[PDB]
Short mmCIF file of C-alpha atoms and ligand atoms in Angstrom, two decimals:
data_model
loop_
_atom_site.label_atom_id
_atom_site.label_comp_id
_atom_site.label_asym_id
_atom_site.label_seq_id
_atom_site.Cartn_x
_atom_site.Cartn_y
_atom_site.Cartn_z
CA UNK A 25 -87.27 99.22 106.82
CA UNK A 26 -88.97 96.77 103.50
CA UNK A 27 -87.10 98.47 100.65
CA UNK A 28 -89.96 100.98 98.71
CA UNK A 29 -90.48 103.00 95.81
CA UNK A 30 -89.99 107.61 96.67
CA UNK A 31 -93.38 109.37 96.98
CA UNK A 32 -95.02 112.96 97.93
CA UNK A 33 -95.65 113.99 101.12
CA UNK A 34 -98.50 115.07 99.46
CA UNK A 35 -99.91 117.58 101.93
CA UNK A 36 -96.60 120.27 100.79
CA UNK A 37 -98.47 124.09 99.16
CA UNK A 38 -99.36 123.56 95.53
CA UNK A 39 -99.87 127.32 95.15
CA UNK A 40 -97.21 129.85 95.96
CA UNK A 41 -96.81 133.84 95.84
CA UNK A 42 -93.63 135.40 96.31
CA UNK A 43 -92.66 139.16 95.19
CA UNK A 44 -90.79 140.48 92.27
CA UNK A 45 -87.73 141.29 93.82
CA UNK A 46 -87.25 138.62 96.27
CA UNK A 47 -86.62 134.79 96.29
CA UNK A 48 -89.47 132.06 95.75
CA UNK A 49 -89.24 129.70 96.93
CA UNK A 50 -91.36 125.59 95.48
CA UNK A 51 -91.30 122.78 98.09
CA UNK A 52 -91.42 119.61 97.46
CA UNK A 53 -90.77 116.65 99.92
CA UNK A 54 -89.59 113.10 99.11
CA UNK A 55 -90.04 110.10 100.88
CA UNK A 56 -88.24 106.92 101.39
CA UNK A 57 -85.49 108.52 98.24
CA UNK A 58 -83.17 105.31 97.35
CA UNK A 59 -81.32 105.08 94.46
CA UNK A 60 -83.71 108.00 92.07
CA UNK A 61 -83.88 111.68 91.54
CA UNK A 62 -85.54 114.68 92.74
CA UNK A 63 -85.61 116.84 89.69
CA UNK A 64 -87.41 120.17 89.14
CA UNK A 65 -88.54 121.12 85.08
CA UNK A 66 -90.72 123.82 83.95
CA UNK A 67 -93.42 123.18 82.57
CA UNK A 68 -94.40 126.21 80.22
CA UNK A 69 -91.15 124.84 78.33
CA UNK A 70 -90.19 121.63 79.61
CA UNK A 71 -87.26 122.70 80.11
CA UNK A 72 -85.05 121.42 82.42
CA UNK A 73 -83.67 123.24 86.03
CA UNK A 74 -82.07 121.10 88.88
CA UNK A 75 -81.62 117.43 89.46
CA UNK A 76 -80.73 116.49 92.57
CA UNK A 77 -78.29 119.60 93.79
CA UNK A 78 -77.10 120.07 90.16
CA UNK A 79 -77.97 123.29 88.37
CA UNK A 80 -77.89 121.21 84.49
CA UNK A 81 -80.33 125.29 83.80
CA UNK A 82 -77.42 128.11 82.72
CA UNK A 83 -80.45 131.09 84.17
CA UNK A 84 -77.99 130.97 87.29
CA UNK A 85 -81.10 132.36 89.16
CA UNK A 86 -82.27 128.89 89.97
CA UNK A 87 -80.23 126.57 92.91
CA UNK A 88 -81.88 123.48 94.12
CA UNK A 89 -81.14 122.97 98.21
CA UNK A 90 -81.13 119.36 100.37
CA UNK A 91 -82.91 119.27 103.67
CA UNK A 92 -81.75 116.15 104.56
CA UNK A 93 -84.10 115.83 108.17
CA UNK A 94 -87.38 117.42 106.05
CA UNK A 95 -86.89 115.23 102.93
CA UNK A 96 -86.71 118.19 100.75
CA UNK A 97 -86.19 119.30 97.64
CA UNK A 98 -85.87 123.23 97.88
CA UNK A 99 -85.97 124.76 93.98
CA UNK A 100 -85.54 128.20 94.54
CA UNK A 101 -85.38 130.91 92.06
CA UNK A 102 -83.49 133.82 92.66
CA UNK A 103 -85.19 137.78 92.36
CA UNK A 104 -87.43 135.64 91.31
CA UNK A 105 -89.69 138.07 87.88
CA UNK A 106 -93.01 138.15 86.48
CA UNK A 107 -92.01 136.00 84.04
CA UNK A 108 -91.30 132.95 86.33
CA UNK A 109 -95.31 132.25 87.30
CA UNK A 110 -96.25 129.24 86.20
CA UNK A 111 -96.42 126.03 87.15
CA UNK A 112 -93.00 123.86 88.06
CA UNK A 113 -92.45 119.91 88.91
CA UNK A 114 -90.90 117.64 90.90
CA UNK A 115 -90.12 115.16 89.46
CA UNK A 116 -88.54 111.82 90.50
CA UNK A 117 -86.71 109.06 88.21
CA UNK A 118 -88.95 105.98 88.93
CA UNK A 119 -90.17 104.45 85.18
CA UNK A 120 -93.09 105.79 85.45
CA UNK A 121 -92.18 109.08 86.43
CA UNK A 122 -93.66 110.66 89.78
CA UNK A 123 -94.49 114.23 89.84
CA UNK A 124 -95.32 117.09 91.98
CA UNK A 125 -96.83 120.05 89.85
CA UNK A 126 -96.78 123.24 92.08
CA UNK A 127 -98.23 126.44 90.57
CA UNK A 128 -95.83 129.67 91.00
CA UNK A 129 -97.46 133.26 91.37
CA UNK A 130 -95.29 136.50 91.47
CA UNK A 131 -96.96 139.52 92.53
CA UNK A 132 -95.91 143.41 93.21
CA UNK A 133 -97.54 143.97 95.70
CA UNK B 12 -72.27 134.95 70.45
CA UNK B 13 -70.60 131.86 69.23
CA UNK B 14 -73.13 129.82 71.09
CA UNK B 15 -74.83 126.39 70.11
CA UNK B 16 -76.99 125.92 67.37
CA UNK B 17 -79.13 123.11 66.26
CA UNK B 18 -77.84 121.16 62.58
CA UNK B 19 -81.26 119.95 61.91
CA UNK B 20 -84.56 118.98 62.90
CA UNK B 21 -84.74 116.11 64.84
CA UNK B 22 -85.43 113.04 62.36
CA UNK B 23 -88.36 111.27 63.10
CA UNK B 24 -88.10 107.67 64.51
CA UNK B 25 -90.79 104.09 62.68
CA UNK B 26 -89.42 101.80 64.55
CA UNK B 27 -91.28 97.98 65.03
CA UNK B 28 -91.96 97.09 68.31
CA UNK B 29 -89.32 94.91 70.30
CA UNK B 30 -86.77 96.59 68.24
CA UNK B 31 -84.55 99.26 69.19
CA UNK B 32 -84.31 102.93 68.60
CA UNK B 33 -82.33 106.11 68.06
CA UNK B 34 -83.28 109.59 68.84
CA UNK B 35 -80.16 112.48 67.58
CA UNK B 36 -79.38 115.88 68.54
CA UNK B 37 -76.78 116.87 66.38
CA UNK B 38 -76.16 120.69 66.79
CA UNK B 39 -72.89 122.90 66.21
CA UNK B 40 -70.75 124.91 68.93
CA UNK B 41 -71.51 122.82 71.60
CA UNK B 42 -69.17 124.09 73.76
CA UNK B 43 -69.63 123.95 77.66
CA UNK B 44 -72.73 123.08 77.05
CA UNK B 45 -74.64 120.15 77.32
CA UNK B 46 -78.18 117.93 75.82
CA UNK B 47 -80.90 116.74 77.28
CA UNK B 48 -83.39 114.43 77.11
CA UNK B 49 -87.12 114.23 77.81
CA UNK B 50 -90.21 112.44 77.17
CA UNK B 51 -91.87 115.52 75.41
CA UNK B 52 -95.97 114.04 76.75
CA UNK B 53 -94.52 112.08 80.36
CA UNK B 54 -92.07 116.00 80.84
CA UNK B 55 -90.39 112.30 82.20
CA UNK B 56 -85.77 113.45 82.38
CA UNK B 57 -84.40 111.37 80.49
CA UNK B 58 -80.56 111.64 80.12
CA UNK B 59 -78.19 114.63 79.55
CA UNK B 60 -75.33 115.18 78.56
CA UNK B 61 -73.36 111.45 79.33
CA UNK B 62 -75.64 110.41 83.02
CA UNK B 63 -78.87 108.37 81.90
CA UNK B 64 -81.45 109.60 84.80
CA UNK B 65 -84.36 107.72 84.24
CA UNK B 66 -84.44 104.90 85.99
CA UNK B 67 -86.30 102.68 82.17
CA UNK B 68 -83.52 100.32 82.06
CA UNK B 69 -84.38 99.60 78.43
CA UNK B 70 -82.82 104.74 77.49
CA UNK B 71 -79.74 104.60 77.25
CA UNK B 72 -77.12 107.43 75.01
CA UNK B 73 -74.70 107.78 73.15
CA UNK B 74 -72.48 110.75 71.82
CA UNK B 75 -70.21 110.47 68.30
CA UNK B 76 -68.81 113.63 68.52
CA UNK B 77 -69.35 117.08 70.56
CA UNK B 78 -72.54 117.50 67.02
CA UNK B 79 -73.60 114.42 66.91
CA UNK B 80 -75.42 112.93 70.35
CA UNK B 81 -78.05 109.81 70.83
CA UNK B 82 -80.44 108.68 72.76
CA UNK B 83 -81.26 104.74 72.22
CA UNK B 84 -84.87 102.88 73.53
CA UNK B 85 -84.06 98.95 73.73
CA UNK B 86 -86.86 97.24 72.46
CA UNK B 87 -89.12 100.24 71.99
CA UNK B 88 -93.75 98.85 73.69
CA UNK B 89 -96.74 100.68 72.43
CA UNK B 90 -96.31 102.38 76.13
CA UNK B 91 -93.22 104.75 74.54
CA UNK B 92 -94.84 105.99 71.85
CA UNK B 93 -94.54 110.19 71.80
CA UNK B 94 -92.24 113.05 71.21
CA UNK B 95 -88.36 112.82 72.78
CA UNK B 96 -87.09 116.64 72.86
CA UNK B 97 -83.55 117.24 73.14
CA UNK B 98 -82.68 120.06 74.50
CA UNK B 99 -79.77 122.54 75.01
CA UNK B 100 -78.99 124.63 78.74
CA UNK B 101 -78.86 127.80 76.65
CA UNK B 102 -80.18 130.70 78.26
CA UNK B 103 -82.93 131.03 76.42
CA UNK B 104 -82.99 127.29 76.58
CA UNK B 105 -82.96 125.61 72.84
CA UNK B 106 -85.46 122.29 72.50
CA UNK B 107 -86.61 120.32 69.30
CA UNK B 108 -88.99 117.69 69.30
CA UNK B 109 -89.19 114.74 67.22
CA UNK B 110 -91.96 111.30 67.05
CA UNK B 111 -91.54 108.09 68.15
CA UNK B 112 -94.22 106.45 66.14
CA UNK B 113 -94.21 101.99 66.89
CA UNK B 114 -95.24 99.76 64.73
CA UNK B 115 -97.36 96.41 65.69
C1 LIG C 227 -91.65 115.55 62.64
O1 LIG C 227 -92.76 115.11 62.38
C2 LIG C 227 -92.97 116.15 62.84
C3 LIG C 227 -94.47 115.81 62.93
O2 LIG C 227 -94.85 114.35 64.11
C4 LIG C 227 -96.68 114.19 63.75
O3 LIG C 227 -96.85 115.35 64.33
C5 LIG C 227 -97.03 115.06 65.93
C6 LIG C 227 -97.95 115.88 66.39
C7 LIG C 227 -97.24 113.06 66.38
O4 LIG C 227 -99.41 113.65 65.84
C8 LIG C 227 -96.63 112.71 65.64
O5 LIG C 227 -96.62 111.83 65.71
C9 LIG C 227 -96.92 112.51 63.94
O6 LIG C 227 -96.21 111.44 62.50
C10 LIG C 227 -93.24 117.92 62.00
O7 LIG C 227 -93.02 118.59 62.75
C11 LIG C 227 -94.98 119.30 61.26
O8 LIG C 227 -93.62 119.48 60.54
C12 LIG C 227 -95.04 120.28 59.64
C13 LIG C 227 -94.68 120.60 57.99
O9 LIG C 227 -94.42 119.87 57.47
C14 LIG C 227 -96.18 121.29 60.66
O10 LIG C 227 -96.60 121.12 59.49
C15 LIG C 227 -97.70 122.41 60.09
O11 LIG C 227 -99.07 123.05 60.28
C16 LIG C 227 -99.40 124.10 60.93
C17 LIG C 227 -100.76 124.07 62.09
O12 LIG C 227 -99.65 123.28 62.72
C18 LIG C 227 -99.78 124.67 59.40
O13 LIG C 227 -100.17 125.93 60.00
C19 LIG C 227 -98.65 124.70 58.47
O14 LIG C 227 -99.64 124.46 57.00
C20 LIG C 227 -99.23 125.95 56.58
O15 LIG C 227 -97.64 125.64 55.83
C21 LIG C 227 -97.95 124.51 55.07
C22 LIG C 227 -95.83 124.12 54.08
O16 LIG C 227 -94.84 123.15 55.99
C23 LIG C 227 -98.28 124.56 53.90
O17 LIG C 227 -98.80 123.25 53.77
C24 LIG C 227 -99.87 125.12 54.62
O18 LIG C 227 -100.56 126.01 53.30
C25 LIG C 227 -99.70 126.27 55.42
O19 LIG C 227 -99.41 127.84 55.22
C26 LIG C 227 -98.03 123.00 58.48
O20 LIG C 227 -99.14 122.10 57.43
C27 LIG C 227 -96.76 120.95 61.85
O21 LIG C 227 -97.68 121.89 62.27
C28 LIG C 227 -95.00 119.81 62.57
N1 LIG C 227 -95.87 119.04 64.04
C29 LIG C 227 -95.72 119.22 65.06
C30 LIG C 227 -95.40 118.94 66.49
O22 LIG C 227 -94.36 120.86 64.71
C31 LIG C 227 -91.30 117.19 61.91
O23 LIG C 227 -91.29 118.77 60.69
C32 LIG C 227 -89.83 118.95 61.28
O24 LIG C 227 -91.05 120.15 62.38
C33 LIG C 227 -91.13 121.09 61.43
C34 LIG C 227 -91.37 122.60 62.69
C35 LIG C 227 -90.81 122.03 59.61
O25 LIG C 227 -90.07 122.73 60.80
C36 LIG C 227 -90.81 121.03 59.36
O26 LIG C 227 -89.73 121.35 58.47
C37 LIG C 227 -89.49 120.12 59.66
O27 LIG C 227 -88.66 118.79 59.15
C38 LIG C 227 -90.68 115.95 61.12
N2 LIG C 227 -89.21 115.95 61.45
C39 LIG C 227 -88.46 115.89 60.36
C40 LIG C 227 -87.33 115.66 60.84
O28 LIG C 227 -89.03 115.69 59.71
C1 LIG C 228 -80.01 101.77 92.40
O1 LIG C 228 -79.90 102.70 91.00
C2 LIG C 228 -78.71 102.27 90.55
C3 LIG C 228 -78.44 103.41 89.90
O2 LIG C 228 -79.22 102.58 88.30
C4 LIG C 228 -78.39 102.67 87.30
O3 LIG C 228 -78.25 104.20 87.03
C5 LIG C 228 -79.56 104.75 87.26
C6 LIG C 228 -79.37 106.80 86.71
C7 LIG C 228 -80.51 105.14 86.45
O4 LIG C 228 -79.92 105.13 84.64
C8 LIG C 228 -80.46 103.31 86.51
O5 LIG C 228 -80.99 102.50 84.52
C9 LIG C 228 -79.42 102.34 86.32
O6 LIG C 228 -79.61 101.44 86.03
C10 LIG C 228 -78.50 100.87 90.43
O7 LIG C 228 -76.62 99.71 90.23
C11 LIG C 228 -76.78 99.83 88.93
O8 LIG C 228 -77.44 98.90 88.70
C12 LIG C 228 -78.26 97.91 86.32
C13 LIG C 228 -78.49 96.75 86.64
O9 LIG C 228 -80.25 97.42 87.49
C14 LIG C 228 -76.13 98.42 86.87
O10 LIG C 228 -76.86 97.84 84.62
C15 LIG C 228 -75.46 96.26 84.49
O11 LIG C 228 -74.40 96.27 84.86
C16 LIG C 228 -74.30 95.16 84.36
C17 LIG C 228 -72.47 94.83 84.52
O12 LIG C 228 -71.88 94.74 86.41
C18 LIG C 228 -74.37 94.88 82.87
O13 LIG C 228 -73.59 93.81 82.17
C19 LIG C 228 -75.63 95.27 82.33
O14 LIG C 228 -75.78 95.18 80.24
C20 LIG C 228 -77.24 94.53 80.63
O15 LIG C 228 -78.44 95.34 81.33
C21 LIG C 228 -80.05 96.16 81.33
C22 LIG C 228 -80.56 96.51 81.85
O16 LIG C 228 -80.62 97.08 83.04
C23 LIG C 228 -80.03 95.64 79.57
O17 LIG C 228 -80.78 96.26 79.20
C24 LIG C 228 -78.29 95.19 78.42
O18 LIG C 228 -79.79 95.06 77.52
C25 LIG C 228 -78.10 94.22 79.64
O19 LIG C 228 -78.15 93.46 78.91
C26 LIG C 228 -76.08 96.15 83.14
O20 LIG C 228 -75.20 97.92 81.88
C27 LIG C 228 -75.30 99.46 85.89
O21 LIG C 228 -74.03 98.77 86.50
C28 LIG C 228 -75.45 99.66 87.97
N1 LIG C 228 -75.17 100.90 88.73
C29 LIG C 228 -74.22 101.23 89.48
C30 LIG C 228 -72.63 102.82 89.17
O22 LIG C 228 -72.49 99.58 89.32
C31 LIG C 228 -78.25 99.90 91.49
O23 LIG C 228 -79.09 98.53 90.89
C32 LIG C 228 -78.18 97.46 92.11
O24 LIG C 228 -76.24 97.48 92.42
C33 LIG C 228 -76.39 97.46 90.96
C34 LIG C 228 -74.66 96.81 91.01
C35 LIG C 228 -76.93 95.57 90.70
O25 LIG C 228 -75.96 94.23 90.63
C36 LIG C 228 -78.33 95.28 90.60
O26 LIG C 228 -79.07 94.07 90.87
C37 LIG C 228 -79.20 96.43 92.21
O27 LIG C 228 -79.99 96.28 91.86
C38 LIG C 228 -79.41 100.50 92.68
N2 LIG C 228 -80.68 99.80 93.71
C39 LIG C 228 -81.12 99.24 93.19
C40 LIG C 228 -81.54 98.74 94.99
O28 LIG C 228 -82.27 99.05 92.83
C1 LIG C 229 -103.66 130.12 93.73
O1 LIG C 229 -103.05 131.73 94.21
C2 LIG C 229 -103.68 132.57 93.50
C3 LIG C 229 -102.66 134.00 93.87
O2 LIG C 229 -102.50 133.36 95.40
C4 LIG C 229 -103.58 132.82 96.42
O3 LIG C 229 -103.61 134.58 96.47
C5 LIG C 229 -104.04 134.92 97.38
C6 LIG C 229 -105.00 136.06 97.74
C7 LIG C 229 -104.18 133.68 98.53
O4 LIG C 229 -105.04 133.48 99.19
C8 LIG C 229 -103.00 133.26 98.45
O5 LIG C 229 -102.42 132.06 99.75
C9 LIG C 229 -103.16 132.18 97.01
O6 LIG C 229 -102.25 131.98 97.28
C10 LIG C 229 -104.90 132.59 93.17
O7 LIG C 229 -105.37 133.75 91.86
C11 LIG C 229 -106.01 134.54 92.75
O8 LIG C 229 -107.43 134.69 92.80
C12 LIG C 229 -107.73 136.19 93.37
C13 LIG C 229 -109.09 135.72 94.32
O9 LIG C 229 -109.49 134.60 95.30
C14 LIG C 229 -107.51 136.31 92.63
O10 LIG C 229 -108.62 138.25 92.75
C15 LIG C 229 -105.88 137.24 92.19
O11 LIG C 229 -106.21 138.52 90.80
C16 LIG C 229 -105.90 135.88 91.97
N1 LIG C 229 -104.80 137.00 91.61
C17 LIG C 229 -103.49 135.59 90.16
C18 LIG C 229 -102.32 135.64 90.68
O12 LIG C 229 -103.65 135.04 89.60
C19 LIG C 229 -105.09 131.28 92.46
O13 LIG C 229 -107.52 131.50 92.70
C20 LIG C 229 -107.48 130.95 90.89
O14 LIG C 229 -107.32 131.95 90.18
C21 LIG C 229 -108.09 133.16 90.52
C22 LIG C 229 -107.85 134.45 89.14
C23 LIG C 229 -109.30 133.10 90.59
O15 LIG C 229 -110.22 132.28 89.46
C24 LIG C 229 -109.76 131.39 91.66
O16 LIG C 229 -111.24 132.08 91.54
C25 LIG C 229 -109.13 130.44 92.11
O17 LIG C 229 -109.35 129.48 92.97
C26 LIG C 229 -105.94 129.73 93.14
N2 LIG C 229 -105.56 128.42 92.44
C27 LIG C 229 -106.29 127.70 92.78
C28 LIG C 229 -106.54 126.62 92.38
O18 LIG C 229 -106.37 128.17 94.01
#
């Protein structure tokens, strides 16, 4: 179709809870990505984690995977800990930027 | 631990509307680590290493050497005002912020 700017699937969960010691998965679905990129950023310190499937952080627990059938960019926090709880942002490199923010709770039980 | 470290604070910048601005992140022992730039108030990623990420056409990067990493904002507007964070992918991450003042 006609060229579109990218937009988020606004039904993706924005409040996620996951277990200490297991992988946490944070999902972001971007339609019509085109030539932009999808990045994941950690709100508490503004640390860049991933851009596309490239991992910037050297905390090797972070990895972003692209699932092409659902246009999903899923941030995986392997071996998640309580200190990993908080807000993360999926960010499309438009100008101005477009963001989808997801809160993560990490619990033992 | 021969880890990267900042050599001095990012200088702040005051620049008239329409002129060009440069932020410089001064580091030592960068090694294989990579300098990222982001805009602190919007959280927008500007660049990582030699790759501009933002599709803002006015944003470029350069390096003079391994110690000296620049973010360039051409023809600054009022919307460019605010903090620009230099970030290193050390573990834990290290960062500094410099601020752009746009004068009319
Ligand atoms: C670049 O500018 C920064 C500030 O920019 C302004 O503020 C931001 C938020 C934005 O609005 C901009 O548009 C503005 O221009 C500088 O960072 C500031 O540095 C000053 C120090 O000079 C900090 O101040 C302290 O503030 C504390 C509370 O916030 C106070 O408790 C503290 O008071 C104690 O210490 C002083 C001595 O410094 C004593 O005199 C007091 O009696 C008391 O004991 C200070 O007043 C201010 O908080 C900083 N702002 C931010 C957002 O960090 C920046 O300066 C650099 O960064 C700081 C952290 C220091 O390391 C400086 O040495 C360093 O140069 C400017 N950068 C440069 C290179 O000048
Ligand atoms: C999809 O994005 C592609 C990549 O964009 C660049 O990279 C991203 C990460 C982001 O940084 C963007 O801001 C970047 O532009 C687009 O391909 C790039 O297009 C730009 C132009 O939009 C090309 O650039 C220019 O190249 C010229 C030489 O060929 C230079 O003369 C020129 O300098 C002038 O222009 C800039 C404005 O950007 C001024 O600020 C300067 O002062 C100076 O006057 C630029 O360097 C860049 O080379 C392209 N990248 C590649 C790898 O080719 C792509 O754009 C489409 O394709 C390109 C080839 C052009 O034909 C575009 O018109 C066209 O739209 C985007 N695609 C779509 C569909 O939007
Ligand atoms: C975001 O999610 C937090 C925890 O996960 C939820 O709890 C599960 C029981 C289930 O619903 C799961 O699907 C959810 O994702 C909520 O915090 C929890 O709130 C409960 C009470 O409802 C409280 O007993 C827990 O201690 C608390 N857990 C944590 C880790 O804080 C959030 O609710 C908000 O925050 C709470 C502290 C409380 O003030 C509540 O009223 C708030 O709505 C969820 N936030 C939102 C905006 O929904």
